[PDB]
Design a protein around this nucleic acid. Structure first.
Ligand SMILES: C[C@H](CCC(=O)NCCC[N+](C)(C)C[C@H](O)CS(=O)(=O)O)[C@H]1CC[C@H]2[C@@H]3[C@H](O)C[C@@H]4C[C@H](O)CC[C@]4(C)[C@H]3C[C@H](O)[C@]12C
Ligand SMILES: [Mg+2]
Ligand SMILES: [Mg+2]
Ligand SMILES: [Zn+2]
Ligand SMILES: [Zn+2]
Length: 1362
DNA sequence: GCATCCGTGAGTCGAGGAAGCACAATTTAACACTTTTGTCAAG
DNA sequence: CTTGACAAAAGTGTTAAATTGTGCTATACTGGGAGCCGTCACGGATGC
């Protein structure tokens, strides 16, 4: 079957053991001598499979005949060695270990279910405090001990073993207390030592024993290696032992009868216990635990009266019960797993739901968070105790290989070292437990085992990272393998390295057609090698494919017919050319290769702008689509000649450029003379006669009788363009001379160059009548006029004729720029004579500013501002003087022509070359008082050059630090919008948006018509939601708006006939998981309605992010866009009115306050003194209308005005940044991203549903839920619109595969696993990860099942059946 | 409300690759021999 | 198709090296060692 969904869930110890083919019991990897895997180790063949196909370890089975067999000698299955990549083992832990993901991922899942703080969980898990599981009637400091109570180590010891203390008596002294006498706190035991607790006092080591013989206080000395064998106050018959020793020579016995008295204790032991004397055998033993009433000895004659630990003292023949309780308190994951197994999720949910009615919001907020985790376990079917590991899975050995390098050295992965540590510690703990080691040692081993598991799963998350000894590089754990820019997702699943790919330097191919590229022969030989081998065999070049491959291995073995065969292999095929960074989809284009000699790829000039490529050393990659589908898609969808318009704005993107523009501008610009320039005559005979006398120039404007003409128009009248260009060939007239020509039945007055341009377009499109309508004859052909020509040709003729026109424009532009005579010399940077006059004026005004400043008429700051204004004004005047000189005296100056035509440079750069450099800014942001008064032609001074370097470095640093921000933003946009596709023709919605044609300019306090570019960016290629009647023209509902329609609407607005246009937009589309054809509009790249199955989400992200690097960075620029897409609260946020009413300013010397007064309401706003109010007294302000200047908080705007208002604000404010930079971007692309930001709602009233108040879900889901509920007469859910940024919107998506591959992988995976989330594979990222066909383009269900059949077969099938 | 803390994020290709010994237990190697296998000429 | 010599071609069985695993030292010894350090954003969680 086909995979349709991917589910993630917790694995139980039972399931982990079902995966494993065996337990890894030893940390041995391979044998150091034979290099074979060690038995029971991390590379065992008996577990993970054979190392070579169909061959066991012992070498008894060596063929596939014994397939599925297991050798009895070695136990290795006889099968394929590839199973060694898929077969898992496991490690059986001596004690449970918590999974760090469900502990350290804030908020922890284990803590939330158990109601334990982050610190409390850590203290228990890492053996710092005990947690009570059974108090057993234990009292701690007069208070009963309760379950789930945390005990410190001292508290546990006091409760479990009691209170006791040893006081060392000074040598020689004798204690004031006897052995076995009860003491009270503060009592003095010895002359200088006082006890601190009440209990039985016991002599530890009596140094002197004083017996009393009866006939006599004989004494004996006690040494450390001796022990007394009798209790105090004992009658000893002559002969009985008294003090024992290692050597019987020093052993002490009693000569006669007496009473033994012990004196001089080494120390005093105070123990809180009850002493029970006995005579017969005791029924208990040391270490036993007893309760009140339990029999101790003498058949019930002596019984316990208190809880404690029973210890029998045979020397004193008494039973001591050290008062203590048998409390059950545990540390580590064994205790936590005990609590997690005892949880009743049914009971917990009921209690949480009851607490969901608490008046406090914090209590309900906490209850909702707990119940969301509880609900996840209840719904998914997972068990909370599965978050603690009893068996640890072991990765297949081939994914953590230990390989021998070409030099014989061994390389291994970090996972083997992490596995060995866990196995070594696990084995050691088992040995310690078998030895009955003390609790201190066991606790250290268990704490180390927990840490070893943590390092294996997520190294460095908790504590110091584990490093391999001899280095400080942290070991790479399982979490590091999956997360980050170098993880599995982004490095191996979302992108890959591919076969049939090449690379080389790119050079310009001017002779190529738009759809052609120059592919080196030696690159194409390797790229198409499998195809070439087949063709070589098909011909007689080689006998078979293997012989052909040997021929190609040696360069000197390649014959000349191999190149003929290669030419046949590539016939008709295309290749993909790729340049990094791929900012938009035009960074990959398909071309038909032309095999060329050399080693560099030839690139067509007209596609360089789309690739952002130049020829300073750039490189491109080459890719070969292999199947018929890949070749068809590349030739139809990705061919360069088919993508001529911009998907972002719909304007031409393959169009005339630097040299092409210059050559076409040069011929279409007319000459202007000054010799005559005014003389008036009576007849043309006189006017021409003066021309022969030299009094008037050919192109000097004159007036013959009443009309203004020139000599050329009167002297040279040509019957047709061919005659005019024949005269140009003979040198009679120039291309720039204005003469009279007869063309298309009209007696035009133009230059031969403009008539030549008209013929160029006419022949390219092969239509003289249509060509005449496409061009503007009476202007020089600059970048904008040539861009309009391409767009109009595309509309009227299509891709094929437009690509031909682009090829003809490129050819003639190149040809005419070579012979025109364009060059740059030092004298071409003409210095206006007005610069000297302006600088002298600035010196006088500056000297006058200093004079006033000396007189005190102004301060330092106003002196500083006035200086900057003076030099800012002078720079503008010098710029104007520079360009006024060019257009009057040097209209054909190379710098003027390049800037005027759009080929190169702008007025700012020309001023620095010809005028003055201007003012420079300090590193701190201030501007130097003294400007750079020299241009580049004159040459800066050393100090001026250094001062100018401050800004140059700052610009370079801004550019470097701006690429990372723009690239990061694009990735956020792609991940939030990647699932949006055009999925149907129409969603049936009746909603729409009104695009405003007028903008409320506040300075003039009135409405003013918006700019054409702004209106076009919001109207072009959009479906009219309602019928519109303007200027006698009826634009019916459902009509796509072309540029002509948009211009008609702008003309209607100019006449006061329409203020806004109702259109369909992605904001109001009702399609699920995408938009419909009617809500999107045109495919701006083709100027026609978008086709179903297009990934408009990806296009929108690339359109927005591509010009991201052109946004200034230095609340403005790219930072402004990033904040708007993240829905961040501005620091200097404006103040808006929550309700509508009249403003009443109460400004006072004490404070500033603004009052919005209504019929009954009076809202008060305390604004700061430095507040730039934009509303004065007596103004009727509506809800959400700003009162103070600044950026509006989108979340405050959403609450006050609504979803529509915030959506309009976000689109307009984002477009302002791009417009300020000259970038043209359709509103559709922003509205698609904004539609994703506003995709969620918050539950406020659950109604008759299981939703929790404050729960965040998708708007589509709640709407579907509400309609279902209403269908059955149940109260619907009341929700609240929600706004979130692109980052948060992408992470809260319903597909965990796409969210896990974005960022926050541990958090995404931990929540998905607990909930048992199932991924339906809806968007593009999920299908790319699994290598499936994406549900867009040719992979969309709308077009995927189309069938093609010819007439003959169709008739046979219909005939053969009917 | 609020600071303060921690945790996660920050463009793309390319090119650069320090015991020592004793002894027991286990494994490996080298014989030995018999037992297939592969040829041979026939027949 | 056999039919008997033949000869390596291989395997089975001891034996002895060669390798590997393991236990044991008796003056008295009793709590570690390396960072050190120029960024900025955000949530989100808690200390209350
Ligand atoms: C009008 C004329 C044919 C008219 C007829 O058949 N009689 C056609 C036939 C071949 C055409 C030229 C070539 O393509 C090369 C080149 C292609 C560039 O794109 C534009 C310039 C060039 C020089 C073209 C100009 C023009 O277009 C020509 C002369
Ligand atoms: Mg370059
Ligand atoms: Mg004439
Ligand atoms: Zn085997
Ligand atoms: Zn729609």
């Amino acid at each position: 079957k086909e995979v349709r969904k991917v589910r993630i869930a917790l694995a139980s110890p039972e399931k982990i053991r079902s995966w494993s083919y065996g337990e890894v019991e030893k940390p041995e990897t391979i044998n150091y001598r034979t290099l074979k895997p060690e038995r029971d180790g991390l590379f065992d063949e008996r577990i993970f499979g054979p190392i070579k196909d169909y061959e066991c370890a012992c070498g008894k089975y060596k063929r596939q005949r014994f397939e599925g067999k297991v050798c009895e000698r070695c136990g290795v299955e006889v099968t394929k060695s590839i199973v060694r990549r898929y077969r898992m083992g496991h490690i059986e832990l001596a004690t449970p270990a918590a999974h760090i993901w469900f502990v350290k991922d804030v908020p922890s899942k284990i803590g939330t279910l158990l109601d334990l703080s982050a610190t409390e969980l850590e203290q228990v898990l890492y053996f710092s405090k005990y947690i009570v599981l059974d108090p057993k009637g234990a009292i701690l400091n007069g208070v009963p001990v309760e379950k789930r109570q945390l005990l410190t180590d001292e508290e546990y010891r006091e409760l479990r073993y009691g209170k006791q203390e040893t006081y060392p008596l000074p040598p020689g002294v004798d204690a004031l207390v006897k052995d076995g006498e009860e003491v009270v706190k503060g009592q003095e035991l010895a002359p200088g030592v006082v006890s601190r607790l009440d209990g039985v006092a016991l002599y530890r080591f009596p140094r002197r024993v004083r017996v009393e013989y009866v006939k006599e206080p004989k004494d004996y000395r006690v040494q450390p290696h001796m022990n007394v064998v009798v209790p105090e106050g004992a009658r000893v018959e002559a002969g009985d032992k008294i003090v024992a020793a290692i050597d019987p020579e020093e052993e002490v016995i009693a000569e006669a009868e007496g009473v033994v008295h012990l004196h001089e204790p080494a120390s005093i032991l105070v123990v809180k216990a009850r002493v029970y004397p006995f005579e017969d055998d005791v029924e208990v033993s040391t270490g036993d635990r007893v309760a009140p009433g339990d029999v101790l000895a003498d058949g019930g004659k002596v019984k316990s009266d208190v809880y404690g630990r029973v210890e029998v003292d045979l020397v004193r023949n008494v039973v001591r019960v050290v008062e203590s309780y048998d409390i059950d308190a545990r540390m580590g994951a064994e205790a936590i797993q005990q609590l997690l197994k005892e949880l009743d999720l049914e009971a917990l949910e009921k209690e949480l739901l009851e607490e969901m009615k608490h008046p406090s919001r914090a209590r309900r907020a906490k209850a909702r968070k707990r119940l969301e985790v509880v609900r996840a376990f209840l719904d998914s079917g997972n068990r909370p105790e599965w978050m603690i590991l009893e068996a640890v899975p072991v990765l297949p050995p081939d994914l953590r290989p230990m390989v021998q390098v070409d030099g014989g050295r061994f390389a291994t992965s970090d996972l083997n070292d992490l596995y060995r540590r866990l196995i070594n510690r696990n084995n050691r703990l088992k040995k310690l437990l078998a030895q009955g080691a003390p609790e201190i040692i066991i606790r250290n081993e268990k704490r180390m085992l927990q840490e070893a598991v943590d390092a294996l799963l997520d190294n460095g998350r908790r504590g110091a990272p584990v490093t391999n000894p001899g280095s400080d590089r942290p070991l790479r754990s399982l979490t590091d393998i999956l997360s980050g820019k170098q993880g599995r997702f982004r490095q191996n699943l979302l992108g890959k390295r591919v076969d049939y790919s090449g690379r080389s330097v790119i050079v310009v191919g001017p002779q190529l057609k738009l759809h052609q590229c120059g592919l080196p022969k030696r690159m194409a030989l390797e790229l198409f090698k499998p195809f070439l081998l087949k063709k070589m065999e098909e011909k007689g070049i080689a006998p078979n494919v293997k012989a052909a491959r040997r021929m190609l291995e040696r360069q000197r073995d390649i014959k000349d017919e191999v190149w003929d065969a290669l030419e046949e292999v590539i016939h008709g095929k295309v290749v993909l050319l790729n340049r990094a960074p791929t900012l938009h989809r035009l960074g990959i284009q398909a071309f038909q290769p032309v095999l060329v000699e050399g080693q560099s790829i030839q690139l067509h000039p007209l596609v360089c702008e789309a690739f952002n490529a130049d020829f300073d050393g750039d490189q491109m990659a080459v890719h070969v689509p292999l199947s018929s589908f890949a070749q068809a898609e590349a030739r139809i969808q990705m061919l360069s000649a088919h993508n001529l318009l911009s998907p972002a704005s719909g304007e031409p993107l393959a169009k005339p450029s630097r040299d092409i523009i210059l050559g076409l501008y040069y011929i279409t610009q007319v000459r202007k003379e000054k010799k005559g320039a005014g003389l008036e005559f009576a007849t043309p005979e006189e006017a021409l006669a003066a021309h022969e006398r030299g009094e008037v120039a050919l192109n000097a404007p004159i007036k013959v009788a009443g009309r203004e003409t020139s000599v050329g128009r009167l002297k040279y009248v040509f019957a047709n363009p061919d005659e005019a260009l024949l005269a140009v060939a003979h040198g009679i007239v120039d291309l720039q001379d204005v003469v009279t020509v007869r063309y298309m039945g009209k007696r035009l007055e133009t230059s031969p160059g403009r008539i030549l341009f008209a013929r160029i377009v006419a022949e390219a499109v092969e239509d003289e009548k249509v060509a005449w309508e496409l061009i503007q004859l009476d202007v020089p052909q600059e970048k904008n006029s040539l861009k309009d020509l391409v767009y109009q040709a595309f509309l009227r003729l299509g891709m094929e004729k437009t690509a031909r026109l682009l090829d003809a424009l490129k050819y003639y532009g190149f040809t005419f720029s070579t012979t025109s005579g364009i060059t740059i010399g030092i004298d071409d940077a003409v210095i206006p004579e007005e610069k000297k006059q302006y600088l002298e004026e600035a010196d006088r005004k500056l000297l006058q500013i200093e004079q006033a400043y000396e007189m005190g008429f102004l301060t330092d700051r106003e002196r500083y501002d006035q200086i900057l204004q003076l030099w800012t004004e002078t720079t503008e005047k010098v710029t104007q003087a520079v360009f006024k000189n060019f257009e009057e005296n040097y209209p054909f100056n190379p710098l003027y022509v390049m800037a005027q035509s759009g080929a190169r440079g702008n007025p700012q750069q020309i001023r620095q070359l010809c005028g003055l450099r201007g003012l420079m800014q300090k590193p701190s942001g201030e501007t130097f008082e003294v400007p750079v008064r020299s241009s580049f032609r004159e040459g800066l001074t050393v100090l001026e050059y250094f001062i100018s370097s401050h800004g140059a470095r700052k610009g370079g640093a801004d550019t470097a630090l701006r690429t990372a921000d723009s690239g990061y933003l694009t990735r956020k946009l792609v991940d939030v919008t990647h699932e949006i596709v055009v999925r149907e023709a129409d969603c049936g919605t009746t909603n729409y948006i009104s695009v405003p044609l007028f903008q409320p300019d506040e300075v003039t306090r009135s409405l003013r018509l918006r700019k054409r570019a702004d209106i076009e960016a919001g109207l072009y290629g959009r479906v009219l939601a309602r019928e519109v009647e303007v200027l006698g023209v009826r634009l019916e509902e459902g009509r796509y708006l072309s540029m002509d329609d948009v211009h008609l609407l702008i003309k209607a607005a100019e006449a006061g006939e329409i203020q806004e246009v109702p259109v369909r937009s992605p904001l109001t589309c009702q399609t699920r998981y995408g938009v419909c054809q009617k809500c999107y509009g045109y495919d701006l790249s083709m100027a026609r309605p978008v086709s179903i199955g297009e990934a408009v989400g990806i296009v929108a992200a690339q359109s927005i992010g591509e010009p991201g690097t052109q946004l200034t960075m230095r609340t403005q620029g790219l930072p402004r866009v990033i904040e708007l897409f993240e829905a961040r609260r501005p620091k200097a946020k404006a103040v808006i009115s929550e309700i509508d009413g009249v403003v009443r300013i109460e400004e006072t010397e004490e404070k500033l306050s603004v009052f919005v007064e209504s019929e009954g309401f009076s809202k008060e706003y305390k604004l700061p003194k430095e507040a730039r109010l934009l509303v004065k007294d007596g103004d009727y302000v509506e809800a959400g209308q700003p009162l103070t200047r600044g950026a509006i908080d989108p979340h405050q705007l959403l609450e006050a005005k609504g979803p529509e208002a915030v959506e309009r604000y976000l689109v307009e404010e984002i477009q302002k940044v791009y417009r300020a930079q000259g970038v043209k971007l359709h509103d559709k692309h922003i509205e698609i991203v904004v539609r994703q930001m506003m995709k969620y709602v918050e539950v406020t009233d659950p109604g008759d549903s299981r939703l929790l108040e404050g729960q965040v879900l998708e708007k589509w889901d709640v709407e579907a839920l509400n309609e279902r509920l209403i269908a059955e007469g149940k109260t619907p859910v009341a929700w609240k619109p929600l706004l979130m940024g692109v980052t948060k919107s992408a992470l809260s998506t319903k597909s965990w595969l796409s969210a896990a591959s974005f960022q926050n992988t541990t958090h995404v995976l931990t929540e998905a696993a607990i909930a048992g989330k199932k991924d339906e594979l809806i968007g593009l990222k999920e299908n790319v990860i699994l290598g499936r066909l994406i549900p867009a383009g040719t992979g969309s269900d709308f077009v995927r099942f189309t069938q093609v059949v010819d007439q003959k077969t169709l008739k046979a099938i219909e005939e053969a059946r009917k």
